Structure 1
Amino acid sequence: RREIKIEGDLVLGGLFPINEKGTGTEECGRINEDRGIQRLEAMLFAIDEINKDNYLLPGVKLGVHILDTCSRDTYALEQSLEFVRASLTKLLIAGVIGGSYSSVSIQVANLLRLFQIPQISYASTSAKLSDKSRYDYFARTVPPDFYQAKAMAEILRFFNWTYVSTVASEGDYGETGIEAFEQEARLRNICIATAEKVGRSNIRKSYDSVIRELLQKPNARVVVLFMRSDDSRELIAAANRVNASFTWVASDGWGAQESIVKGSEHVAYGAITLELASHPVRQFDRYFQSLNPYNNHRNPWFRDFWEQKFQCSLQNKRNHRQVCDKHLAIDSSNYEQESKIMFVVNAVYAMAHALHKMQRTLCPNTTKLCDAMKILDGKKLYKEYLLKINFTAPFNPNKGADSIVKFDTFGDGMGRYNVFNLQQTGGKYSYLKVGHWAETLSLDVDSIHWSRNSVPTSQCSDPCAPNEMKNMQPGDVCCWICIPCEPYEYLVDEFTCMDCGPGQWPTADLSGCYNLPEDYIKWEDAWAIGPVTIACLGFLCTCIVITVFISGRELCYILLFGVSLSYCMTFFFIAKPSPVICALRRLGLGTSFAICYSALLTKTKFISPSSQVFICLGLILVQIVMVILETPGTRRYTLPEKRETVILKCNVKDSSMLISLTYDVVLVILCTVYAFKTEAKFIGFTMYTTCIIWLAFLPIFYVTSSDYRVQTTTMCISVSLSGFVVLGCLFAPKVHIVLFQPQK
């Protein structure tokens, strides 16, 4: 019963969410101050200007039949029948400036298409409405949501927010808007933590309940809101009750409205919102601010709008009529243009230009309506003129940013968006443009005020440490686990790690492998150094015995050579092992063995036996023909358990050394039964005892087969022990005779 009707040659219908959707009991609730009245006056402002100028339908006066949708599709369909009552076969509306809600526009488009009434819809961004095979009389001055979904996944990719949660309003704007976003999120490798839907249906969860589900997954600290204006207002309220806090990535449903966050700015602080690219209509705000509840009689809802805006009473709102000041008026202090005001004016002018071009075609003789337009053809108006319209946007400077009002082949606008940030200015909140999106996002990250004073991170799992690997479970991208690889495996990639080569450390960066260092007994071996001094001390004792003198002299020379060789071999064996000098250590054992053979040969005329005694020993075969070992190469000793432990192992296993030296160890048995021959009796007893000590030492080294570093000292101990026996026993008769008896 409440409507706007203005007489005119051609009448344009208009659907505006003038009053916000009511509760369950009341179909129509409070008034929509920004998105229901400013837009309504924008249509009225455009129609006044269209009739004012003489270049757009000068001979035709444009009338209006504007209704209210109450933000409900069912209510919108109820009112929309007035546009079609006179159109039955039996005001003859030429066109309809479509609804401001995707559900409302879709509902009314399904009806108007039957009667061939073209519909231009500002602010309706559902991607379903671009299906021209179903809505064949529908065009919009705003882009679809197929582009807004791109502008979100790009923002969620610029900041590596790969683990996000989605909340979407029920209907067509939210269901299809979030359906395209999850498609654009999959391409950019973004994982949806959880997807929820809110609305007034019984299936939908409560706003507190959906808030809990967002909090259940604390890793995803950003949520994307493809929600309507009322749901966005209420969801932020539900986050105030729980006192939660997220980073809000919002759509044009939220947009750049201060009223959504009114009172709950604490949780909505640092929000990222995607408003369509638009500019204020400067001529419009002059028209709007001049309005008063006394002259705007043509607008029925304006009287109620005046009361609600200023919280005063015109006649009986506060049981009286004195609260509303007579001098009070709309000004820049309390008024800010709705973002989609240009898209309403362009929508109205698109209809006028379509008729104006058609009028110049069907009625060229007269500027007024001719007989061809007594009955109007909707299909001709839409397909030929409206769908191919092209003009400079009125009331906008021709700076190129205003661009054109052209529709594309789908009857849609250009996909350009702005990015806003909710910031606090000394206790006052506002939206600041922090980027845009024409085809690639360009964000001014330095000016963004974040919710927690730092760039939010929304990742399913934390990055893995350099010592840690990760793997992809089937169907997941953003979620992994951090398994630390064992200190011997190495990382070819973060996806898999496996062992290096034997005796090969996996470097420090762990992405490569390098051979483990070889270990050998250095000069730090005090015990080995101490035996070396003892071996040198034994040589000094032999030299003292030699210095004392000056039977046969062959025994003295042979005994001296063996003892010195045994002492010298200990120092040589304690040196740094090498593959070239591997045979020297093997030869070192033979040098002591040759000395032992000489003692047996000497103990067993006299001048002749000396030549056959040393020669009989073999002389170690001239050191195996001047000698590099029995095994041509020296092996790096590596255990199955690496543990950063590698030993230098010569080719010889230290097993055949008991054969070459064992030749001189068998003559002691023949001297075991030897007796008398005095004073040669004492010499034989010492030699037998000396051979006994050598046998015990050999089993000790054989027992210590493992622990080469420890077993290495066994050879030094055996070498020192052998020298003591040879020097103590063989040199003992000389010490007790030459030194013991001063006669010599």
Structure 2
Amino acid sequence: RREIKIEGDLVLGGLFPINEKGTGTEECGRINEDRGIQRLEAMLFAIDEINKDDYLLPGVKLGVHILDTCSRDTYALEQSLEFVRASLTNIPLLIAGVIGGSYSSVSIQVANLLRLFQIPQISYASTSAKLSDKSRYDYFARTVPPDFYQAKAMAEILRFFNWTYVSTVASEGDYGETGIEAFEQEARLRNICIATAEKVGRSNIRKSYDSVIRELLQKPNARVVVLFMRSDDSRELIAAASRANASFTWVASDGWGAQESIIKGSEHVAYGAITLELASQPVRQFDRYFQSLNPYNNHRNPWFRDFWEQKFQCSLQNKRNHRRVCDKHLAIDSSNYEQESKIMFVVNAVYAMAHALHKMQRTLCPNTTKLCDAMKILDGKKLYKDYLLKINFTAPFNPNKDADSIVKFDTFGDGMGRYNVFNFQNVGGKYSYLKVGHWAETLSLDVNSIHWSRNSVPTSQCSDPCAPNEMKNMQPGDVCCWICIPCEPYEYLADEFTCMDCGSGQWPTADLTGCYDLPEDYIRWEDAWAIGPVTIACLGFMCTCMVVTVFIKHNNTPLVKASGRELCYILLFGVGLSYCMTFFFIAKPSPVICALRRLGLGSSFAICYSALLTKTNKFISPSSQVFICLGLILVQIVMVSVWLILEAPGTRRYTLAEKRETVILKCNVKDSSMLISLTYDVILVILCTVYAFKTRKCPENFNEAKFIGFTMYTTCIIWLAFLPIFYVTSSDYRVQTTTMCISVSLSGFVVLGCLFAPKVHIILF
């Protein structure tokens, strides 16, 4: 057990990580040359400047009880019991205040131990968000800000360089656990995620660090990484990475910062690393004090001999067992001396404790400037509550009067966040840390960082931005990385994760949120191709004009009375509807006209053949017979299909392609059923041809009867030729269908000419 005890009226405790695992197997075999020894000497310098100070604690000498921690919380707890030994009531020494540990876990443990005994504690380097809780850490304070501002700064720098997909590794201690969670929160706030998260602990690098490095190398797509991990573990992790030839850009916290002791002989893996360190003004007085230190005059520090032996490999007063005997002519010159950043923090903590003690002495002993019997017993609770948390003083050694000069304590005994940005660089062949930014609540990064590959290292290449016109999200292995595969073949894809089809007769818009129904091709068909049957309709109008001409002779008392007067007008009615039938087919396929379309075709064809059959076969019966079959056919079809199917056109025929919408859906079904009706319609027409083909041959109208047989002969051939073209009608709803009905119109026009040919022959003659 080694300690530095100085007798005095008031004694200040001290916990520093002098012993730490460097290059060896012992837990704390080596000695910290920048973290422990430097801070111990800074505290001693502050104490012995305060003792000789006249404006601060006049006539009162401040003692020290500096101890070791070995960078372990359990060892710190074991060795901190001497601070409360004198409070029970190696002579006990009463500790007025204890300077906090350098590690978050150690500081937490000492705070928990000292809360019960009411001993104020001020830390200099414990930046942990788990602390500052006035429910379990009542007697604790620190000059450094928590990890919240550090995590915010890390998120800001990650967003500045467009770093989205990163790999993360931290420690298992009280420092890594809370800081890493704060980092996760601040990263998910800024819409960035992490590849994986690892937690390391104080153990051999054979298993844990090697596995961490291998896993990090297993995902080459992520290059930049963060380090919420302690310095003692950081050195071993860097050594393992150098052994495995790592190629990552580390983003370090205040644990590593601008410390050159972590990287020694392995500077090629830490090249280009961006490290975060708290902003501090170097103290020239402390620099001179440390440079004036010698092994001989420094009998106060038991660890100074070991520190000198580790800094310069030689024996101070031992035998020649070491590789050299000290030349006795070398000191700590500026060539190999680098003042630690967190030295002014220790100085400020010591001076704040001294100021609190001095002000309490002044308010408790107004008459004399000396310790009194009333202050023999110290009330730590009241001291911390009022005279420590409400202190405001200029920095002990600062030639400026800026904001940083004033040392204050927040409501939680916290500090202000001004984390500097440091980048590892190689200039002139000498590796050194160069400041490239300053997080004064606003990131102020300068473009001077030297990266690993002399270029801005990219990331998030697995999930690149993609246009939402056809791309879709797919995450087979990890939630973060997505592949923008092309989906939605003419379908809406409003949801980015999944793509689904609009359905039949629907076309998506540019927004991919609402499918639009394209206009029907059958509707508004009167412009280019459907005007073809309009000429046939015009020919049908000429046929209608011909229908006007044929009855003129029949109206003006025709001489030929052999032909039935009623029969002649009956057959003219059938051909008239045939000319008018084609108008419905080429018109707008309205629901009203669909039912009329089938009635027009079925009735006109039936009555035309019925009238011819009756004419071939006193005169009362042929008129009644013609109406009987015509009425029966019209009545039968009424109660068969049209009164049952309830035809209603709609969108259909979109199976072949989504860019096609037929206006008829139920009417198209009736069109398919009309094929059976067409065969039934031609069944009676074909039967009529055979029944009266040169069978009766009445001498009164033998020429007409022979001509009438010719009309039946040409109709069956025309009707039969229409069947093959009706099958390909469905292929062209707005093209083939219009031409399909032209066959009926052509047959009607042909029938009218030949039937009335004997009638017009007499007129011409």
Q: TM-score range by the shorter chain?
A: 0.7 to 0.9
Give CA-to-partner distance per residue, 1:207-266, whole Å, 9 cap, x none: 102323445566766554321101111112222333344443432212232333444444
Q: Contact 1:13–1:64 (CA<8 Å) still a contact in 2?
A: yes
Q: What does the per-residue CA deviation read over 1:624-674, in whole Å, with 9 as the maximum and x for residues that have no partner?
A: 999999989999978897778878998995699999999999997798579
Quote the offset at 1:347 in angstroms: 0.9
Displacement of 1:411: 3.0
CA 1:522/1:382 → structure 2, altered by over 3 Å: closer, same or farther?
A: closer
Q: 1:341 offset after TM fit, Å?
A: 1.3
Distance 1:57 1:401 in 2: 25
Given that 2:575 and 2:752 are in contact with CA atoms closer than 8 Å, whether structure 1 keeps it comes out as yes
Shift of 1:415: 4.4
Quick one: distance in 2 between partners of 1:632 and 1:86? Answer: 101
Q: CA deviation at 1:504?
A: 1.7
Structure 1 stretch displaced more, 302-311 or 234-243? 302-311
Q: Cα 1:405–1:598, aligned 2, differ >3 Å: closer, same or farther?
A: same
Q: Shift in Å at residue 682 of structure 1?
A: 5.9
472-481 vs 606-615, which moves further: 606-615
Aligned to 1:205: 207
The SS at the match of 1:673 is helix
Q: C-alpha separation between the residues in 2 aligned to 1:464 and 1:282?
A: 56
| Partners of 1:524 and 1:262 in 2: CA distance | 88
CA distance in 1, matches of 2:623, 2:95: 141
CA distance in 2 between counterparts of 1:113 and 1:675 reads 125
Q: Taking structure 1 as reference, are residues 423 and 584 closer, same or farther at Cα in structure 2, changes over 3 Å only?
A: farther
Q: Deviations over 1:467-495 (max 9, x none)?
A: 67879999998587878765465244436
CA distance in 2, matches of 1:95, 1:667: 121
| Equivalence map 1:300-319=2 (5 Å) | 300-310=302-312
For residue 751 of structure 2, the aligned residue among 726, 731, 735 is 726
Q: Deviations over 1:267-315 (max 9, x none)?
A: 4445444433433334433443454556656545445434533556656
Q: Equivalents in 2 of 1:407, 1:315: separation in Å?
A: 46
| CA positional deviation for 1:122 | 0.9
Label 1:434 to 1:615 Cα distance change in 2 as closer, same or farther (>3 A): farther
Matched, 1:624 2:637: yes
Deviation of the 1:712 alpha carbon: 2.4
Q: Distance in 2 between matches of 1:705 and 1:380?
A: 97
Question: How far 1:710 sits from its partner (Å)?
Answer: 7.3
Deviation, 1:39, is 1.5
3-state DSSP of counterpart to 1:196:
strand
1:431-473 Cα offsets, whole Å, 9 max, x none, are: 4555555667666689695879446545997767636787999
Checking the alignment, whether the CA contact within 8 Å between 2:652 and 2:662 is kept in structure 1 is no
Moved more, 430-439 or 384-393: 430-439
Give the TM-score normalised by structure 2: 0.71
Taking the aligned partners of 2:714 and 2:288, their CA distance within structure 1 comes to: 127
Unpaired runs of 5+ residues, structure 2, are: 553-562, 696-703
Indicate if the aligned counterparts of 2:144 and 2:414 stay in contact, CA closer than 8 A.
yes
On the 8 A contact 1:580/1:629 being kept in 2, the answer is no
Change (3 A) 1:433 1:680: same
SS in 1 for 2:741: helix
Question: Secondary structure at the residue paired with 2:34?
Answer: helix
Tell me the equivalent position of 2:670.
653
Residues 401/281 of structure 1: CA separation in 2 closer, same or farther (3 Å cut):
farther
702-711 or 588-597: bigger deviation: 588-597
For residue 584 of structure 2, give the secondary structure of its aligned residue in structure 1: helix
Offset of 1:353 from its aligned partner? 0.3
Say which is worse superposed, 80-89 or 335-344, in terms of deviation: 80-89
Q: Which sits farther off after the overlay, 230-239 or 651-660? A: 651-660
Shift of the 105–572 alpha-carbon distance from structure 1 to 2, 3 Å rule, reads: closer
Contact 2:84 2:94 in 1 (8 A): yes
Query: Displacement of 1:374 after TM fit?
Result: 5.3
- The change in CA–CA distance for 1:342 and 1:469 in structure 2 (over 3 A counts) is same
CA 1:686/1:210 → structure 2, altered by over 3 Å: closer, same or farther? same
Deviation at 1:172, TM superposition (A): 2.5
For the residues of structure 2 that align with 1:373 and 1:197, how far apart are their CA atoms? 48
Q: Distance in 2 between matches of 1:27 and 1:624?
A: 104
Alpha-carbon distance, 1:344 to partner: 0.5
For residues 619 and 634 of structure 1, the distance between their equivalents in structure 2, rounded to whole angstroms, comes to 34
Secondary structure at 1:432 match in 2: strand
Secondary structure of the residue aligned to 2:530 is helix
**Cα–Cα, structure 1 residues 709 and 446, in superposed 2: closer, same or farther, change >3 Å?**
farther
> Could you tell me how far apart the structure 2 residues matched to 1:663 and 1:183 are?
79
CA offset digits 1:307-334 (Å, max 9, x no partner): 5335566566985797866665545544
Q: Secondary structure at the match of 2:569?
A: helix
Structure 1 CA distance for aligned equivalents of residues 182 and 85 of structure 2: 37
Between the aligned partners of 2:122 and 2:518, the Cα distance in structure 1 is: 77
Distance 1:652 1:387, change over 3 A: closer
Hey, what's the Cα distance between the residues in 1 that align with 2:59 and 2:177? Answer: 45
CA contact (8 A) 2:389 2:409 kept: yes
* Distance change in 2, residues 1:730/1:116 (3 Å): closer
Question: Could you tell me how far apart the structure 2 residues matched to 1:411 and 1:64 are?
Answer: 23
Inter-partner Cα distance in structure 1 for 2:289 and 2:763: 137
Contact 1:45 1:284 in 2 (8 A): yes
8 A contact 2:472–2:499 mirrored in 1 = no
1:593 touches 1:660 (CA, 8 Å); kept in 2? no
Q: Is the 8 A contact 1:72 1:104 kept in 2?
A: yes
Deviates more, 1:661-670 or 1:418-427: 661-670
| Structure 2 CA distance for partners of 1:494 and 1:428, relative to 1, 3 Å | farther
Question: 1:123 deviation in Å?
Answer: 0.6
Report if the CA contact (8 A) 1:468-1:485 is conserved.
Answer: yes
Per-residue CA shift, 1:552-584, capped at 9, x if unaligned? 999999999999999999999789989999999
TM-score, structure 1 normalization: 0.72
Distance in 2 between the 1:97 and 1:371 partners?
25
Structure 1 residue 97: Cα displacement: 2.3
Contact persistence 2:166–2:223 (CA under 8 A): yes
Structure 1: which 5+ runs fail to align? Answer: none
Q: Give the superposition deviation at 1:360.
A: 1.5
Between the aligned partners of 1:64 and 1:10, the Cα distance in structure 2 is 9
Partners of 2:364 and 2:374 within 8 A in 1: yes
| Bigger mean CA deviation after superposition, 177-186 or 518-527 | 518-527
Asked if 1:587 is matched to 2:599, the reply is yes
Whether the aligned pair in 2 keeps the contact of 1:473 and 1:480 (CA below 8 Å) is yes
Contact 2:15–2:69, Cα closer than 8 Å, also in 1: yes
CA contact (8 A) 2:591 2:647 kept: no
Cα–Cα, structure 1 residues 32 and 598, in superposed 2: closer, same or farther, change >3 Å? same
State the 1:588 CA deviation. Answer: 10
Q: Distance in 2 between matches of 1:676 and 1:79?
A: 131
Q: Deviations over 1:654-707 (max 9, x none)?
A: 699999999999997798579999997467436523444324525752795676
Is the Cα–Cα contact under 8 Å of residues 435 and 443 in structure 1 kept in the other structure?
yes
Partners of 1:584 and 1:629 within 8 A in 2: no
Alignment partner, residue 544 of structure 1: 546
The separation in 2 between residues aligned to 1:28 and 1:684, in whole angstroms, is 124
Aligned to 1:549, the other structure's residue is in SS state helix
Q: Distance in 2 between matches of 1:660 and 1:187?
A: 71
Deviations 1:353-408 (A, max 9, x none): 01211222233333344454556554554444223322122212444331532223
When residues 533 and 451 of structure 1 are mapped into structure 2, their CA distance, relative to the original with a 3 A threshold, is same
- Secondary structure of 1:275's partner? strand
Residue 402 of structure 2 aligns to a residue whose secondary structure is coil
Sort the Cα spacing of 1:67 and 1:548 in 2 relative to 1 into closer, same or farther, 3 A.
closer
What is the total number of aligned residue pairs between the two structures? Answer: 740
Deviations 1:47-80 (A, max 9, x none): 2432343211232233434344333345445654
Mean Cα deviation higher: 244-253 or 516-525: 516-525
1:514 Cα shift?
1.4
The alpha-carbon deviation at position 608 of structure 1 amounts to 20
Give the Cα separation in 1 of the matches to 2:41 and 2:177.
30
Give a deviation string over 1:684-742, Cα, whole Å, max 9, x none.
436523444324525752795676367527616736974896699789999999999xx
Partner Cα distance (1:42, 1:36) in 2: 10
1:174-232 superposed Cα distances (whole Å, 9 cap, x missing partner): 34444555566677777665443322358995210232344556676655432110111
**Cα distance, 1:503 vs structure 2:** 1.4
